[PDB]
Each structure stands twice: as structure tokens, then as C-alpha cells.
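Colleagues,

Please find the record for the two-part complex below.
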Amino acid sequence: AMDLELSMSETLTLPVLPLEDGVVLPGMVVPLDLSENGEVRAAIEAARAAAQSRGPVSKPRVLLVPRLNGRYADVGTLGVIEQEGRLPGGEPGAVVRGVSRVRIGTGTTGPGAALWVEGTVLEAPPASGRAQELAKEYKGLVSAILQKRGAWQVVDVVQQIDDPSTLADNSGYAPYLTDEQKIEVLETVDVVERLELVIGWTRDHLAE
Amino acid sequence: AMDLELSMSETLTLPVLPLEDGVVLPGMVVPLDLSENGEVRAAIEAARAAAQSRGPGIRSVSKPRVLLVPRLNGRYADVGTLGVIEQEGRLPGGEPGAVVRGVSRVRIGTGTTGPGAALWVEGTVLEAPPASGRAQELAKEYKGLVSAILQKRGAWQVVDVVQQIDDPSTLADNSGYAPYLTDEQKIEVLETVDVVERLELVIGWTRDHL
């Protein structure tokens, strides 16, 4: 038997992948153009280098932090570099999948040229009763918007998102929500008030 | 305002099989002399290992996949040809040989790692978009040019099929068999993905040789 105490702690040290004008929320799968900003590929390389200093399957994991006009948010998104590819102009590209919220903590040092920060992962709690109820309403509101656009496959797949937190964070795909609105969705930890937040904006966009 | 509708192509990882002389274009099938050639045989063995079957009893061995890249005194081309090792055995001359079929164009990108002693690079399969209407007219004009050369050469079995090739991309890439074209021209054929450009390239080179 081994003791092992105060381990598996919730505070991680992750490289910051800055999103200059974009927000990636947990559950989202988005492409990343690595041609435009140097700090982006440096964060992926720093994440991969730290995995190679731990010695020998880990797809590299970064901390997706939106940076609106030179200022980082208080919450980041733990993201997995699922795959690297090429964009139509031959740009180096990467597929990233958001996993969970990470409350941004104090800065730290690490390998590579990326900024390393410490942070505590905010494990999503089990869904409450109002969250399930709010998820049903948000599905209907989002479906109505997609129906006017004729995006019926999108209607079909959105209706299959049964986790209320994942459904609320699916608002990151909405083109009618501003970058700053999606930052507030990221920083709103509680799912119920996060759903009520995106439900109001979605209800506002329908009324236009 | 991140772009959430970006088209993302898949990135392949293949062992580099260097070709000192000659360019293998998509649609071609050629032999490979493995005699006293460590680089070529290492690429095939690295491809075989990377193709090792992945199940306890249901595992099926796939054909090895290599990247046939046009290299003269270094300076590997920016585009290689995805090659499928169709057969392995001995060539008629007695040499240890392999038969490779060119499949598609691959844009050579970042280097990487892999099994075996071969050099591994990352690459992207380049689209073969449907032939334009103008591309159809380039193919009809190009068939008349290559037919005159083949009929002058007496290659009647070849000219029979060449003028039946419906796809303009396959028709243009068949110029890799032509002795009257140089490898620097062939590498440029391997270089231009657009079928309209290639036909418009090879039509000019064919006329200036006729």
C-alpha cells in the first residue's frame, strides 16, 4: 500500500492559447487558423513539449482563453487538440474540442514560448430541475431560429444535446451573439443563470 | 468573430520514398528497383509496419502507402504522389522490385516521426474537383496533340486508350510516361492541382515538341 495524499488536485498548469476575437465553450468543436497569431501555435507546441518532458496517447491540451482587445477573461476553456489539418489557403489548422471551464488563476513558468498559467477546473455538477426545464425552452427557441434558415440537420443535432450545460455552451456557435456576450456565457458558472442569459438573448434575436 | 465554418482537410503521415529520376503522377503504375537501394526499401518497410494489422484474429493487412517525392540533389518537391504498393517480388531483370500505383497529390507539410528507418512527413490530400467545362475543351484539344506523337511513334495500343480517357486530370497526368518531357516539367505537372492549368501547361509543351 502507498499513501498518496493531497494528489489528483484540481489546480492545473496549462499553456494559454489566446483567442483574439473568438470564444470556445465546453462541448464545442471548432477549427483554429494557426497562420494568423503566433501565440496560438506556441501554446500548442508548449503543451506538446510539457507532455514530452513527462516522458512516454495524450492529445495536447491547452487553455483556450478569450482575449478581447488585449485583456484575458477570468475563465478559460480546457481544450483538446484533437487533430491538425490544412485550411483552404494552405494554412496550418487544428481541430480543438472544449472540455470544461477553468477559473483563470495566477501566472507561472513553463517550457516553450507560451504563457503558462495555473487554474482550477470547474467540474460541472449534475443538472438541476430548472436546468432541464430551461434546456427544453432553449431548444425550442434555437430550433425556431434554425428553421427560418432551413438548417434542419442543425435542428436535428441540437435537439440531441441532452446535457443542459453543454446545450447552454452550444450558444458559442450562434452568429447573432457578440464576442462579449459569449465571454459572459463562459464566465457564468451556474448553468441555470447561464441558460436564462442565453434564452433572453435568443428570445431577443427572434423578436427582430 | 471566429470563423466556425472553415473547411478543414485531413493531414496524412507517410514515409518519403525519394525518386532520383522520374516523377510518378496520379494514375500511373510503375516498377521500383529495390536493389542496393536502402532508402527506397526502408520507405516500403516503414510503410508496411505502419500498415500492420490491428486486431487479434480479424486483423487484415492493408497495402503499404508511401509518398513518392521528385528529388534531384536534394530540394524535395513541395508535392508528392500518394503511392500504393500493389505488388512485391522480382522484376524481369532479376532485381528485387515493387509495383506502385500513384493515387493522388499530397501537399508536403511539416516533418514528423514514424516507425522504421524512413523519413516521415505530414501531408494533405489535394482535391480533384470536377472538371470544368473549359477543362473538357482542353482535354479534347490535348488528345489530338498526343495522338499525333503516339501515332508517329507507332504506339497504337496506347493511343487507342489515351483518346478514350474521359477524365481530363487523368489524361494530363498520363504525360508522366512521355519520354519527350523532362522531370522539371513533370514536377510542375505534379505541382499544379488545377486541371485547367495542367492541360494548358502540357498543351503548350506538346505543341513546342511537335
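The domain at 11-125 of chain B is CATH 2.30.130.40 (Archaeosine Trna-guanine Transglycosylase; Chain: A, domain 4).

Comments are welcome before we finalize the supplementary table.
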